[PDB]
């Protein structure tokens, strides 16, 4: 149907959760959704549709990096009529204002990619989420007893960075964590007039070098899953 | 005291309203503040402190352009201990999603300036406001019956643009209006761990050419002044 | 051992074939090698070890885009001691010098990514494969009766391009096709002193709009696989 | 008449002296001009028209930073028919070739702004003054016995620099001092076929941290005012 | 004694004429110098010392392109203690303010080269000549009755331009003609604290499409050779 | 018939050898080619035609620097129908992988020039040689018992480098040596669909600080000239 998704037209609900890892998406469908159905599996990049509290939710994996994420987000919006995209995932914290198990809401995504300069006149595109989704995240968190840590993330083309000396400057300008897709998810949604947000769970702190156990990673991520599913229903 | 502000240390309250035009600042102090006093007038750039709803509120003009804005808010934060900065002004609309008399909340500020590349490793800094201020703005607007328009603005180094052909692309990427300081205000407050937000009043639509009358301009700006003073009080 | 590969130490042979699509990796293992074993499956990105003419060879998926490829190639080399990396995939031809079913050998990978500027002093890194590997591909292609097309590819961060007007200029400068990882593969191998080559199968011509049928794509990819395994044996 | 200038057509003489501070423009009017008349006061940015030794001369403030300066100069040239723009002011000296009380003629204005790459094809524009104006300055400086230092100046977007370590390299390349607008003045006059020149007075040496006193500062600026008024009458 | 000049210490005079064409240099030696001797010839690039009307004067070729001109200029200043360098040659006119047999004095050289950004913090270096030289060239051409045209040139890395569409814009910004070295000549003299200037003869006009006859060519040139030699004595 | 080459059409053979130093192409003409003949001498840039083991061969000098090399390669290809261009010269070694007297085949040419960004959409053009020339060079050298060292060179605009600290990073990314032309040759030949290759001999070593004596020069260069003539014959 598209080069990277083999779902039937109409297989996706208009609200879609996203993770880089398709096995995480599979985890969510199996453990949290009723009547979950795998609807796409091209390149092993799984997607699902199902129900949370009687409301249709879709789930899609998008792979690693801005360019992979942009492909899947573009197709979801343009072909499968997805309207709200909520990306959840882990991110490595870089600021003293956050600690392990915090959930970060990215109200901006800085980047070392050239993609937004290519998209946007070789100027500075401030890649931002949709405000209404941000507000709904904030209200849902408060009602679930989650204190969201709110600021920028830095979306890098590099997992193994050549600029680790720059993390302090990043944190100084209110970047709470690093990840690798948010700047692309946001720019793509701005391009295509869709609503997007990125929420990140802090499982590793890149400055203090603290890190969650395997058991603390699943329970931490489960709390962010419930935040996400509750703000979509 | 500073080369551009001759206020005594402690003359500014920790919350400050900003406008580019110091005569607008003077107008606010006279008409809307209780017991206002002029606290600075270097280079004719006026600033005031007064009371609103029994509460201390400061006003400061910052001139035109990112470079001028950056001078004044660096000094307010680092010398005068200002903690919260709310910028209000007019902005030229470029998007069909906004019309005359709308108030825009800028949740991102793109730019053609080099200043953030200089600040931020030659990468893309997503210049964003403080989320708690933006939440306060949204809730106050709602109480006042204001239908707040929320999106990016584009902060240009050019009043007379050489890139008019690009306003449609800017609008496509959710830039609601163009102005000349938000990116610098946001970057500087990010740099200095302060809270900032820009609100923009639509007095002219740059695409469809419609314009407010002189009386409608006064009313429109007054509506924004009330919003601003109510969210800080 | 790494965040993205769960193979045991020594699971990888020092020669490794790469594809973006892990399911093609899996196909090669099941159809073309003997005693094939799945050695890694983090994020559904499958990797294999097996034998071709009794010589050990490994296979690994690397996902889409320079950022994803760079992660997997960095890890293969630094942790798993892989020394020779040969990437085969499909590409979108932009030059009249090539047509459907052609196999392109990328002696250079131009890019619109910023990653090599970040890696290399903000100058122009000419990302290139290992000559001996490319010499070896040429000799194997001749002794196989394959008419190897030879030239540059363009690695883009965009599957859905914003610069399709530029494909003719690219073709002028001897870019035969467009893909999305070569420049990252080549730069990573240059950084880490390993040997890499990208081979490119034309299944769609982006100018003439010709395309292969599903049956023909199977046949065309199978020949490229043979060239790859032969030059590794 | 223009959004930023209050004057009626013909209020401005074709020659105009400029400073960032409107209160210096006001000081020049009162102390040095006969029949002086305030002709514009938008945003408290003052301008005047008067006579010096029977010659009609205009004065205009332009605020701080390239963007603010560019607004005012554009409107002076394109609406008020100003042909010759002479900017005087202070500047922080960075060169061992100059010292307190020296007056510098800016034969080039380097910048960290992006505005000239926006104007000029993303190449390097050498912003320069009009030669005939620079000759009149040299000739008038000699007639008055002023030892005119001649060289480049660096126009920064930052009053509070993030690259103070770079001042030595600037001086090495014959930048005598730092200010914040000459590069935009020069580029605006080049765009609009007008004659512009910048002179600036050293009352503070940024490297040796020598400063003038609140007494020699007044007389230094007077010396420069007289030089400017002379070379225009 | 340098890798590119095989002259002896002291064999250069502190005033030197340069051209890209060494064969044009000999023409100046034979037809204008008394006691003329060839002093260097590596890579067939010729230089001369002789006397003009009783004042000693050197001549040197510098090849084509900024990088070539930078090599020779650097060695002339650093090793042979040249202090004044005057560059003459022809240049394609692009402005309607100049016609054939006009001599252009370049008060600024803009460029599409990256060399000055590498020299100068990736900012905009305004590459300018030494003022007192330019003042000399002005006085000399006047009592010699030459109507010297003064403005900018654009130094390109490209003789065969890929941006011919842009000459009009260059002309708008007071670029009278295009050549290929002035930006590197001026920047190198700034870096090493020497005094340089560049003069330019219009023999071809790139907009209008005239060309001088071969008769008028080394006729217009000699009028500028004379101008040059006159302003060194 | 071009502004920089004197020869008549028909004087150049299709295969052409290139050097920067025109005295060096003269050396080659007198020692190695029978029926040698000088065919151009504009700007003292000499070219020659003769025979080697029967087949006709041309020689041409091109000066120093990408801009200079580009003028000549362009005129050669476009006016004089040259179709193979083989560049030989000396290069400063920067890698431990090569020692003096080694012969380097440049399979890619990185650069600090802006010229390829100007040519190629401000992206990263990977400048590479024609693959068949490089295959000829390798088969020949193997027959002549020469151990060919293959990798990138770095083409710089700077002979006297401002980034000497970066040579280690260049060599880490498989840059064996530095020169000033290869990226311009490779990109001009890509632009104009001609076959080009660069070879250079290591007479000095920039990191270890060796050299060859005046006569070790001449002999190592001869081993390269014989490689070149053999592969064109």
Is residue E204 flagged as an active site residue? yes
Positive or negative, the CA dihedral D133, D139, D145, D151 is: positive
User: Å from B159 to nearest chain D CA?
Assistant: 6
Distance between CA atoms of residues F125 and F120, nearest Å:
6
CB contact under 8 A, D123 and E105: no
Coil, strand or helix: which one is E38? Answer: strand
C126: nearest CB among F105, F128, F163: F128
How distant is the alpha carbon of residue B28 from its chain centre?
Answer: 14
Per DSSP bridges, beta strands E15-19 and E55-61 are parallel
C160: nearest CB among A66, A74, A114: A74
Per DSSP bridges, beta strands D47-52 and A15-19 are unpaired
User: Å from B145 to nearest chain D CA?
Assistant: 31
Distance between CA atoms of residues C2 and E224, nearest Å:
70
Looking up tokens 């005598």, which residue turns up? D176
User: What contacts 24+ positions apart, CB below 8 Å, involve F30-36?
Assistant: F32/F225, F32/F226, F32/F229, F33/F57, F33/F59
Which chains sit next to F, with 3 or more Cβ pairs under 8 A? C, E
Tokens at residue F188, please?
């001009």
CB F80, CB F5: distance < 8 Å:
yes
Domain total in chain E: 1
Nearest to C174 by CA among F119, D2, F158, E156: F119
CB count within 10 Å of CB B167 equals 19
Tokens at residue E68, please?
């070539």
CB B17, CB B61: distance < 8 Å:
no
Chain E positions touching F112 (Cβ under 8 A) are: 114, 118
* Interface membership of B123 toward D (CB under 8 Å): no
* Interface membership of D22 toward B (CB under 8 Å): yes
User: Which domain range does residue B33 map to?
Assistant: 1-233
- The enclosing H or E element of C19 equals strand C15-19
DSSP per-residue letters across B61-108? E--SSHHHHHHHHHHHHHTT---EEEEEEEEEE--TT--TT-EEEEEE
Question: CA-based angle A114:A120:A124, to the nearest 5?
Answer: 70
CB contact under 8 A, C118 and A163: yes
Distance between CA atoms of residues F35 and F32, nearest Å:
10
CB contact under 8 A, A158 and C70: yes
CB count within 10 Å of CB E220 equals 18
Nearest to B188 by CA among B104, B111, B85, B89: B85
Distance between CA atoms of residues F44 and E20, nearest Å:
11
Residues 6+ apart with CB under 8 A from E89: E19, E20, E21, E24, E179, E200, E201
Distance between CA atoms of residues B187 and B123, nearest Å:
13
* Interface membership of C151 toward F (CB under 8 Å): yes
For chain B, breaks with the C atom over 2.5 A from the next N come after none
CB B151, CB B179: distance < 8 Å:
no
* Interface membership of F192 toward C (CB under 8 Å): no
* Cα atoms in the 13 Å half-sphere on the side-chain side of E143: 7
CB C92, CB C155: distance < 8 Å:
no
Tokens at residue B129, please?
């406001």
User: Å from C168 to nearest chain A CA?
Assistant: 18
* Gyration radius (Cα) of chain E, Å: 17
Which chains sit next to C, with 3 or more Cβ pairs under 8 A? A, F
CB contact under 8 A, E121 and D172: no
Distance between CA atoms of residues C140 and C105, nearest Å:
12
A157: nearest CB among C3, C66, C159: C66
Tokens at residue A222, please?
């489960």
Q: Is E143 annotated as a binding residue?
A: no
C145: left (phi over 0), alpha (psi -120 to 50) or beta: left
SS (H, E, C) chain F: CECCECCCCCCCCCEEEEECCHHHHHHHHHHHCEEEEEEECHHHCCEEEEEECCEEEEEEECCCCHHHHHHHHHHHHHCCCCCEEEEEEEEEECCCCCCCCCEEEEEEEEECCCHHHHHCCCCECCCCCCHHHHHHHHHHHHHCCCCEEEEEEEECCCCCCCCHHHHHHHHHCCEEEEECCHHHHHHHHHHCCCEEEEEEEEEEECCCCEECCHHHHHHHHHHHHHHHHHHCC
CB B132, CB B126: distance < 8 Å:
no
Nearest to F159 by CA among F23, F63, F39, F35: F63
Chain D positions touching E126 (Cβ under 8 A) are: 108-111, 126-128, 152, 183
* Cα atoms in the 13 Å half-sphere on the side-chain side of C6: 8
Interface test with E, best of F65, F71, F72, F120 (most E CBs within 10 A): F65
* Interface membership of B127 toward A (CB under 8 Å): yes
CB contact under 8 A, A64 and C71: yes
Distance between CA atoms of residues F105 and F170, nearest Å:
16
Closest chain D residue to B20, measured at CA: D43
User: What contacts 24+ positions apart, CB below 8 Å, involve D207-216?
Assistant: D207/D93, D207/D94, D207/D96, D207/D167, D207/D168, D207/D171, D210/D99, D210/D100, D211/D100, D212/D100, D212/D101, D216/D100, D216/D101
DSSP per-residue letters across chain A? -BTTB-PPTT-S-SEEEEES-HHHHHHHHHHH-EEEEEEE-GGG--EEEEEETTEEEEEEE--SSHHHHHHHHHHHHHTT---EEEEEEEEEE-STT--TT-EEEEEEEEES-SHHHHHTTTSB------HHHHHHHHHHHHHHT---EEEEEEE-S-SS-S-GGGHHHHHHTTEEEEESSHHHHHHHHHHTT-EEEEEEEEEEETTT--B--HHHHHHHHHHHHHHHHHHT-
CB contact under 8 A, E44 and F23: yes
SS (H, E, C) A55-82: EEEEEEECCCCHHHHHHHHHHHHHCCCC
E59: left (phi over 0), alpha (psi -120 to 50) or beta: beta
Instruction: Give the phi and the psi of residue D67 in degrees, each rounded to 5.
Output: -65, -40
Distance between CA atoms of residues E224 and E141, nearest Å:
9
Chain B positions touching A187 (Cβ under 8 A) are: 173
D53: left (phi over 0), alpha (psi -120 to 50) or beta: left
Q: What is the DSSP letter of D14?
A: S
Per DSSP bridges, beta strands A47-52 and A55-61 are antiparallel
How distant is the alpha carbon of residue C189 from its chain centre?
Answer: 12
Q: Is B20 annotated as a binding residue?
A: yes
Q: Is C10 exposed, middle or buried (0-12, 13-18, 19+ CB in 10 A)?
A: exposed
Tokens at residue F51, please?
């025979």
Per DSSP bridges, beta strands A195-205 and A84-93 are parallel
* Interface membership of D67 toward B (CB under 8 Å): yes
Chain B positions touching D23 (Cβ under 8 A) are: 43-44
CB contact under 8 A, E43 and F66: no
Distance between CA atoms of residues D17 and D4, nearest Å:
17
Distance between CA atoms of residues E62 and E22, nearest Å:
7
CB contact under 8 A, D173 and E125: yes
Give strand pairing partners of E156: none
A67: nearest CB among C61, C66, C162: C66
User: Å from C4 to nearest chain A CA?
Assistant: 10
Distance between CA atoms of residues A107 and D149, nearest Å:
50
B173: nearest CB among A172, A173, A190: A190
Closest chain C residue to F138, measured at CA: C135
CB contact under 8 A, C118 and A157: yes
CB A25, CB A45: distance < 8 Å:
no
Strand spans (E) along D53-102: 55-61, 84-93
Tokens at residue A123, please?
């100027």
Q: Is E37 exposed, middle or buried (0-12, 13-18, 19+ CB in 10 A)?
A: exposed
What separation, in Å, do the N-terminal and C-terminal C-alpha atoms of chain A show? 28
Distance between CA atoms of residues C196 and C132, nearest Å:
10
CB contact under 8 A, A119 and B173: yes
CATH of the domain at A20: 3.40.50.1580
CB count within 10 Å of CB A110 equals 32
Count of pairs with CB atoms under 8 A, one residue in B, one in D: 113
Distance between CA atoms of residues F223 and F219, nearest Å:
7
CB contact under 8 A, A115 and C67: no
C128: nearest CB among F116, F121, F152: F152
Residues of F carrying an active site annotation? 204
* Interface membership of E156 toward D (CB under 8 Å): no
Chain F positions touching E21 (Cβ under 8 A) are: 43
Positive or negative, the CA dihedral C102, C105, C107, C111 is: positive
Tokens at residue F171, please?
């060599």
Question: CA-based angle F85:F86:F91, to the nearest 5?
Answer: 135
Resolution rounded to one decimal, in angstroms: 2.0
DSSP per-residue letters across E49-103? EEEETTEEEEEEE--SSHHHHHHHHHHHHHTT---EEEE--B-EE--TT--TT-E
User: Å from C181 to nearest chain F CA?
Assistant: 14
E23: nearest CB among F3, F44, F64: F44
Coil, strand or helix: which one is D217? Answer: helix
Coil, strand or helix: which one is E181? Answer: coil
Distance between CA atoms of residues C174 and B233, nearest Å:
65
Give strand pairing partners of C56: C51
Distance between CA atoms of residues B141 and F50, nearest Å:
86
User: Å from D21 to nearest chain E CA?
Assistant: 26
Dihedral, A23, A24, A26, A32 alpha carbons, nearest 10 = 160
Interface test with C, best of A20, A27, A68 (most C CBs within 10 A): A68
Residues of B carrying an active site annotation? 204
A120: nearest CB among B120, B173, B193: B173
Q: What is the DSSP letter of E191?
A: H
* Interface membership of D173 toward B (CB under 8 Å): no
Nearest to E86 by CA among E228, E230, E233: E228
Coil, strand or helix: which one is B211? Answer: strand
User: Å from A114 to nearest chain C CA?
Assistant: 5
Nearest to C232 by CA among C49, C15, C48: C15
Chain E positions touching F156 (Cβ under 8 A) are: 67
Residues 6+ apart with CB under 8 A from B62: B18, B19, B20, B45, B68, B69, B71, B72, B73, B87, B181
Please list, residue by residue across D153-185, b when 16 or more beta carbons sit within 10 angstroms of its beta carbon and e when fewer do: bbbbbbbebeeeebbeebbebbbbbbbbbbbbb
Distance between CA atoms of residues A172 and A150, nearest Å:
14
Nearest to F187 by CA among C180, E154, C169, C196: C169
How distant is the alpha carbon of residue A55 from its chain centre?
Answer: 21
* Interface membership of C23 toward A (CB under 8 Å): yes
User: Å from D61 to nearest chain E CA?
Assistant: 24
Verify D-B touch: 3 or more CB pairs within 8 A.
yes
């Amino acid at each position: 149907m598209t080069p990277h998704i083999n779902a039937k037209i109409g297989d996706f609900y208009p609200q879609c959760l996203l993770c880089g890892d398709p096995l995480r998406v599979s985890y969510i469908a199996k453990k949290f959704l009723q009547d979950a159905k795998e609807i796409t599996n091209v390149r092993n990049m799984l997607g699902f549709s199902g129900k949370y509290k009687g409301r249709g939710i879709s789930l899609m994996g998008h792979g690693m990096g801005i360019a992979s994420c942009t492909i899947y987000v573009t197709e979801l919006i343009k072909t499968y009529q997805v309207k709200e995209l909520l990306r959840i995932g882990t991110c490595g914290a870089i600021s003293p204002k956050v600690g392990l198990k915090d959930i970060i809401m990215a109200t901006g995504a800085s980047t070392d990619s050239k993609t937004n300069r290519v998209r946007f006149l070789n100027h500075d595109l401030s890649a931002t989420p949709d405000f209404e989704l941000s507000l709904r995240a904030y209200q849902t968190a408060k009602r679930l007893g989650i204190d969201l840590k709110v600021g920028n993330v830095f979306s890098s083309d590099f997992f193994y960075s050549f600029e680790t000396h720059a993390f302090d400057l990043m944190a100084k300008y209110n970047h709470l964590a690093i990840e690798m897709e948010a700047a692309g998810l946001y720019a793509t949604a701005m391009e295509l007039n869709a609503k997007a947000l990125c929420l990140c769970s802090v499982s590793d702190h890149l400055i203090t070098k603290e890190a969650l156990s395997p058991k603390e990673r699943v329970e931490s991520f489960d709390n962010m899953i419930i935040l996400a599913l509750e703000m979509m229903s």
